[PDB]
Amino acid sequence: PGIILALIGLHLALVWFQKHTQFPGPGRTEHNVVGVRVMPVFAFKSGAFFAAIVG
Amino acid sequence: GPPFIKMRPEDMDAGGMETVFPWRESDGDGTTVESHHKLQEIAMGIRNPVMLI
Amino acid sequence: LGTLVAFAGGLIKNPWKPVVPTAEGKKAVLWTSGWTPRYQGETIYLARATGTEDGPPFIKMRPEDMDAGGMETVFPWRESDGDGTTVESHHKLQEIAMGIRNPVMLI
Amino acid sequence: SSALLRTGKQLFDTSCVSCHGANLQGVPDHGPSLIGVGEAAVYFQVSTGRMPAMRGEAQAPRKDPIFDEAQIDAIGAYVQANGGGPTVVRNPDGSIATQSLRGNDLGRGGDLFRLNCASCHNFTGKGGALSSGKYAPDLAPANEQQILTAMLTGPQNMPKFSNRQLSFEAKKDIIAYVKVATEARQPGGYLLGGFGPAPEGMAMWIIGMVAAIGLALWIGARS
Amino acid sequence: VVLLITGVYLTLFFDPSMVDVTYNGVYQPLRGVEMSRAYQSALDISFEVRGGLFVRQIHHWAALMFAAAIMVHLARIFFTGAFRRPRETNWVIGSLLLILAMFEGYFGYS
Numbered sequence: 344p345g346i347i348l349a350l351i352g353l354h355l356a357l358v359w360f361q362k363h364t365q366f367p368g369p370g371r372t373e374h375n376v377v378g379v380r381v382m383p384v385f386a387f388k389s390g391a392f393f394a395a396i397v398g
Numbered sequence: 399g400p401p402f403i404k405m406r407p408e409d410m411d412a413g414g415m416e417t418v419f420p421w422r423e424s425d426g427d428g429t430t431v432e433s434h435h436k437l438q439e440i441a442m443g444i445r446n447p448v449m450l451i
Numbered sequence: 452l453g454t455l456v457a458f459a460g461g462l463i464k465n466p467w468k469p470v471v472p473t474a475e476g477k478k479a480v481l482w483t484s485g486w487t488p489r490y491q492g493e494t495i496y497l498a499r500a501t502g503t504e505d506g507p508p509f510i511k512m513r514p515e516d517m518d519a520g521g522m523e524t525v526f527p528w529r530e531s532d533g534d535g536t537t538v539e540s541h542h543k544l545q546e547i548a549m550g551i552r553n554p555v556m557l558i
Numbered sequence: 559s560s561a562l563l564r565t566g567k568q569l570f571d572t573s574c575v576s577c578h579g580a581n582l583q584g585v586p587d588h589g590p591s592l593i594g595v596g597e598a599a600v601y602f603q604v605s606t607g608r609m610p611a612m613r614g615e616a617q618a619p620r621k622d623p624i625f626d627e628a629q630i631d632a633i634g635a636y637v638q639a640n641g642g643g644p645t646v647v648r649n650p651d652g653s654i655a656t657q658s659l660r661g662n663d664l665g666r667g668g669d670l671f672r673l674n675c676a677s678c679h680n681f682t683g684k685g686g687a688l689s690s691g692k693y694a695p696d697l698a699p700a701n702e703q704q705i706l707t708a709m710l711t712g713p714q715n716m717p718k719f720s721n722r723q724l725s726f727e728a729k730k731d732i733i734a735y736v737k738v739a740t741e742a743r744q745p746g747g748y749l750l751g752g753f754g755p756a757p758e759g760m761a762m763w764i765i766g767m768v769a770a771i772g773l774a775l776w777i778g779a780r781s
Numbered sequence: 782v783v784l785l786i787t788g789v790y791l792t793l794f795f796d797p798s799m800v801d802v803t804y805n806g807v808y809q810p811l812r813g814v815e816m817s818r819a820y821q822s823a824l825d826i827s828f829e830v831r832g833g834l835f836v837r838q839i840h841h842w843a844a845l846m847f848a849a850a851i852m853v854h855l856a857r858i859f860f861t862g863a864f865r866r867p868r869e870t871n872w873v874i875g876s877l878l879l880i881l882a883m884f885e886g887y888f889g890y891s
């Protein structure tokens with residue numbers, strides 16, 4: 344569990360600082376990220392998903 | 399055979415002390431596993447020991 | 452190097468050191484079985500398990516206690532082990548019952 | 559009226575002689591001799607329905623019985639009159655014992671079952687597969703006398719447990735353990751069949767993962 | 782996360798020994814049988830702690846879901862091509878995590 348926790352921390356850090364990938368679409372380029380900000384929306388969706396999985 | 403043996407009043411002088419435990423002859427000596435369990439539970443009880451003065 | 456060797460040196464054991472006493476000296480564990488004689492001519496019975504613990508967990512067998520289509524598991528007895536009354540014989544028997552090379556099929 | 563096995567040798571002659579012979583001699587093509595066998599073998603083979611059998615192959619399966627109205631007794635007595643095989647247990651009324659064949663110790667019975675019986679059937683008496691066709695059936699619908707006669711007569715490819723290597727108490731205790739293991743609840747929810755992790759993995763993949771992926775499809779947009 | 786929480790709960794009742802004892806518990810069809818101390822501790826969790834069977838069942842189901850979700854995530858990463866130039870090392874870390882999860886689940890249910 345300790346090794347797994349360290350590796351998961353490193354994994355999520357690398358994903359956070361190398362921004363996420365995306366699918367080609369209308370306004371998507373290799374130089375921008377199109378989505379929603381964390382602030383109101385993304386934390387909300389993540390927490391609701393957590394609760395549903397626990398359920 | 400004996401981890402516990404009975405006592406008589408003459409087995410002590412006027413300046414002696416001794417620790418004693420409850421015997422209950424239905425416990426028997428420590429030969430079988432049943433009597434061995436009974437005796438090992440007698441030996442470990444936090445209110446069993448007694449000083450005889 | 453010295454530190455790592457001292458760290459990983461308490462775990463290492465030799466699998467071939469003679470520790471098991473037999474009738475030709477002492478052997479390694481991986482070649483003795485419990486069916487191995489100990490003093491050159493001892494009798495080892497084919498005892499069977501009864502599943503009860505009043506006195507017998509193991510009893511001897513006769514050739515007539517089986518028909519032409521039967522199978523039975525047996526264990527080495529060594530009458531010097533006795534029934535499971537005292538703690539000493541109980542330990543001996545519980546070590547007979549758990550040995551990875553002891554069981555045998557009788558056909 | 560025990561001096562009447564004229565019935566018995568009225569049904570055998572019209573349902574068995576094509577595969578065992580008129581004198582119970584084992585037609586050298588299909589059937590065994592049936593001389594050393596007794597009433598217990600006939601009872602187990604007919605009451606469970608494995609008898610009179612069609613084509614006959616790696617395993618005769620269990621089917622619906624053909625004979626009752628005390629004619630299983632007729633064939634059993636007729637076959638016992640031609641040999642000395644084991645006999646079916648009886649109660650003080652003359653009927654076949656059901657309740658007297660249940661022991662009172664389930665620990666010893668379960669240990670004996672795990673040592674002798676669980677290898678082919680299961681931990682708790684579900685089925686098990688043998689080589690090249692043959693399998694070991696489920697122990698749920700068999701009653702007590704059928705269990706006793708099964709481990710007493712040693713049917714096809716099942717070993718034969720005499721009354722000298724498995725005494726009568728041992729058999730009664732095994733019967734009691736089997737009948738209790740087939741009739742106890744599952745105190746953890748719906749058991750997925752009695753087997754190990756295969757139904758559990760299937761239920762995971764086909765319930766939990768589809769629920770999770772469906773909620774992921776609902777919450778998140780698709781593009 | 783759920784695995785961590787339920788395992789921390791479970792560690793308060795488990796005794797990992799291999800010494801032999803006789804059961805003498807509440808489960809009757811096993812009374813008088815000689816068993817190790819770990820098996821007896823697991824039986825005691827199952828039958829003598831209010832809500833222990835529920836917790837160990839949650840633990841096992843969560844382990845299964847952990848493994849399945851890891852495999853589906855790996856399938857996504859592979860098929861969409863999200864392992865290319867900037868992210869090979871993140872792929873490597875994920876592979877190590879997969880191996881460790883497999884062996885951890887094995888050691889757990891043993």
Ligand SMILES: CC(C)=CCC/C(C)=C/CC/C(C)=C\CC/C(C)=C/CC/C(C)=C/CC/C(C)=C/CC/C(C)=C/CC/C(C)=C/CC/C(C)=C/CC1=C(C)C(=O)c2ccccc2C1=O
Pocket residue numbers: 756759760763764767852853855856859
């Ligand atoms: C995609 C990836 C595997 C490519 C790797 C690239 C490759 C070149 C690297 C080398 C790998 C080597 C050479 C060979 C790999 C083969 C094997 C030895 C690998 C070991 C572990 C491996 C890497 C794990 C990957 C397995 C794979 C990704 C599983 C994903 C399956 C898919 C995507 C699920 C989609 C949704 C799903 C189908 C919902 C429906 C449910 C169905 C029925 C799931 C089927 C199903 C499954 C999958 C069970 O595991 C299972 C287990 C026990 C009982 C039943 C089931 C069962 O029904």
Ligand SMILES: CC(C)=CCC/C(C)=C\CC/C(C)=C\CC/C(C)=C/CC/C(C)=C/CC/C(C)=C\CC/C(C)=C/CC/C(C)=C\CC/C(C)=C/CC1=C(C)C(=O)c2ccccc2C1=O
Pocket residue numbers: 355356358359363389782786789
């Ligand atoms: C301060 C205090 C502790 C001192 C104690 C004082 C002392 C005297 C008392 C002693 C008492 C001791 C013995 C015990 C105290 C504590 C004890 C009771 C704890 C034992 C276990 C206990 C029951 C645990 C309770 C806590 C529990 C209810 C809360 C759990 C909820 C938490 C852990 C959820 C966090 C989730 C996770 C770790 C955060 C990761 C960051 C988030 C999720 C972003 C992740 C994320 C990233 C990073 C992406 O890049 C990304 C990219 C694209 C899509 C998605 C994502 C995405 O989701």
Ligand code: HEC
Pocket residue numbers: 569570573574576577578588589590592595599600603604609610611612614618633711712713714
């Ligand atoms: C040829 C078709 C066939 C018919 C019809 C048939 N049997 Fe059988 N019987 C067999 C075969 C084949 C076996 C071998 C057992 C096996 O392999 O399952 C057998 C086995 C038996 C056995 C057990 C033999 C043993 O050694 O344990 C008995 C008892 C028996 N039959 C009696 C009967 C009775 C009663 C009937 C109903 C009148 C009947 N048979 C009709 C083919 C048949």
Ligand code: HEC
Pocket residue numbers: 606608617618619620671674675676677678679688692693694695696697698699700704705708709713714715716717719732
């Ligand atoms: C894998 C070898 C094997 C062993 C060991 C074994 N069985 Fe069987 N058992 C079988 C086979 C094969 C059959 C099917 C015989 C038939 O259909 O004629 C069977 C049939 C039965 C049946 C009939 C099931 C029914 O629904 O009619 C019972 C009851 C039974 N066995 C009980 C036991 C008991 C009790 C033991 C332990 C003493 C045991 N078996 C050990 C293989 C075995």
Ligand code: HEM
Pocket residue numbers: 344347784785788789791792795823826837838840841844847882885886889890891
């Ligand atoms: C991280 C991945 C983990 C996996 C995949 C995993 C998996 C498992 C599984 C499948 C079991 C079997 C449970 C049962 O059958 O009843 C188990 C048992 C157990 N786990 Fe975990 N586990 C994990 C983490 C942990 C952690 C972090 C802890 C403690 C901090 C823990 C503590 C325990 C304990 C004590 C048991 C034995 C208790 C019992 O069997 O009832 N586990 N594990």
